Design a protein around this ligand. Structure first.
Ligand SMILES: [Zn+2]
Ligand SMILES: [Zn+2]
Ligand SMILES: [Zn+2]
Ligand SMILES: [Zn+2]
Ligand SMILES: [Zn+2]
Ligand SMILES: [Zn+2]
Length: 208
């Protein structure tokens, strides 16, 4: 059960806690003490927080304003707070070099660098399969597979990066990240990308 808070009033998060059994950190939604030993401790980085040297970056979570007290998360020296702050690289929507409409990056990025949140509704494959066969009011829809269980629907609540085209050889990928207790989708560069290049995702399975 993904994102299930534990709730065992007056009891600690021991080997009887579902979070501990399933081997996941206790999160913001869990009813346990803020001092719970099964919670994520955050980081004490000096800045950046964009390499495996950062505990938060490594655990696929953004830094936490009330836990990451040195890196800049509580203040833009921390580069692991972008989804929270609504920060992103500059992107251009333009006619694709391939065909139709495309997204072109306007800032250079390095391999594994954050580009933008991919906004939308995270839904199950079941809910996606429904929307797919059922009569819909929206004409032009935007959806891709995160993995084999979940899809992002960017039709109603998407942002500009939803216009990025499909490729089985993509230059970008998606991370499902823990962001202040919620799962949010980050788009990262799969390789170094120069300014003016078109961005591509693998729609089959974007979570690389
Ligand atoms: Zn617990
Ligand atoms: Zn818990
Ligand atoms: Zn706990
Ligand atoms: Zn850090
Ligand atoms: Zn941190
Ligand atoms: Zn940080």
């Amino acid at each position: 059960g993904s994102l299930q808070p534990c709730d065992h009033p007056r009891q600690p998060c021991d080997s009887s806690c579902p979070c501990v059994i399933a081997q996941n950190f206790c999160e913001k939604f869990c009813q346990c003490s803020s001092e719970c030993q099964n919670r994520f401790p955050g980081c004490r980085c000096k800045a950046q927080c964009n390499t495996k040297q950062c505990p938060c970056y490594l655990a696929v979570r953004e830094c936490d304003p009330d836990l990451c007290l040195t890196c800049g998360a509580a203040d833009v020296s921390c580069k692991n707070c972008s989804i929270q702050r609504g920060s992103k690289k500059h992107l251009l929507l333009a006619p694709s070099d391939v065909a139709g409409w495309g997204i072109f990056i306007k800032d250079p990025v390095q391999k594994n660098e954050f580009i933008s949140e991919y906004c939308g509704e995270i839904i199950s494959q079941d809910e996606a399969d429904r929307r797919g066969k059922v009569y819909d009011k929206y004409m032009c829809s935007f959806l891709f597979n995160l993995n084999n269980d979940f899809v992002v629907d960017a039709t109603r609540k998407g942002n500009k990066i939803r216009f990025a085209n499909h490729s089985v050889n993509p230059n970008c990928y998606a991370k499902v990240m823990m962001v202040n207790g919620d799962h949010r989708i980050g788009i990262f560069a799969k390789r170094a990308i120069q300014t003016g290049e078109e961005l591509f995702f693998d729609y089959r399975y974007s979570q690389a």
